[PDB]
Design a protein around this ligand. Structure first.
Ligand SMILES: C[C@@]1(N2CCC(c3cc4cc(NC(=O)C5CC5)ncc4cc3Cl)CC2)COC[C@@H]1O
Length: 262
């Protein structure tokens, strides 16, 4: 297959609304990623959000083309693949690499929040790596505006991935967008440090969640994580979204600022 002057050479991945392909320009050899979407109001909102993005830890938007009923969304190709494939199951990854990925994730999230955008589905499958292992937040099909004209809008739509969602999404009619992204970044940090997700969902009927609320850190995955990043996880994975640590205070955390190497 092809799109104008590009060849669709390989399937990079897929989601509920389309598939992502590797596009190689026949003439210049420039390699990009292209989201191919079949059939309109959702993609309109997505293209609007995509054109606002300009940051080193966010996937760049190059442009779009419509060919009949198929939309092609050209984006920056991240040649290192996903953060998901760098997490060894039941092990995680070296703490210095987890910390570097966490700083870059914070930088992307501060940027998105600064321009009034919430990603709403932060997880390792959506965190891509460039050729120098720089983290890029990808896929804005669930992203939305939570601040416009310096006025915050509370969210109410259920979305995301259950092991990564914050508990207020399940227990509240309306909720603040920022604490939700911070909570999923804590689950991403747990995954990088232990290679294991702590629960199916943070609900009243989930025993692993109740175990965390009761501070049973002698259980997995918490027992594989050092006391310093565990102390930061204790401030991020707080049930009340208003008691939960904000990103300005995550940047003052002992582990966040702890020099690490290897
Ligand atoms: C929906 C999900 N994906 C969300 C990101 C999505 C995507 C992929 C990409 C992969 C690469 N680079 C590489 O693959 C190089 C070869 C190693 N570069 C840019 C990409 C841009 C996007 Cl938007 C694929 C679909 C997330 O949940 C389940 C799915 O995986």
């Amino acid at each position: 297959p092809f799109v104008e002057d590009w060849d669709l050479v390989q399937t990079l991945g897929e989601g509920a609304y389309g598939e992502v392909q590797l596009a190689v320009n026949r003439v210049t050899e420039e390699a990009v990623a292209v989201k191919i979407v079949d059939m309109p109001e959702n993609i309109k909102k997505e293209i609007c959000i995509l054109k606002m993005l300009n940051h080193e830890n966010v996937i760049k938007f190059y442009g779009h083309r419509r060919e009949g009923n198929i939309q092609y969304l050209f984006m920056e190709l991240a040649s290192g693949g996903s953060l998901f494939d760098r997490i060894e199951p039941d092990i995680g990854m070296p703490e210095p690499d987890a910390q570097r990925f966490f700083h870059q994730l914070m930088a992307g999230v501060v940027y998105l929040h600064g321009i009034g955008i919430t990603h709403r589905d932060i997880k390792p499958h959506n965190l891509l790596l460039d050729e120098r292992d720089n983290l890029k937040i990808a896929d804005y099909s669930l992203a939305t505006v939570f601040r416009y004209n310096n006025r915050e809008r509370l969210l109410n739509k259920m979305c995301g991935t259950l092991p990564y969602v914050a508990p207020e999404l399940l227990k509240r009619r309306e909720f603040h967008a920022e604490p939700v992204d911070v909570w999923s970044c804590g689950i991403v940090l747990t995954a990088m440090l232990a290679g294991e997700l702590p629960w199916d969902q943070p609900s009243d009927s989930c025993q692993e969640y109740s175990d965390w609320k009761e501070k049973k850190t002698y259980l997995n995955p918490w027992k594989k994580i050092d006391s310093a990043p565990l102390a930061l996880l204790h401030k991020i994975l707080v049930e009340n979204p208003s008691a939960r640590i904000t990103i300005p205070d995550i940047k003052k955390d002992r582990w966040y600022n702890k020099p690490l190497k290897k």
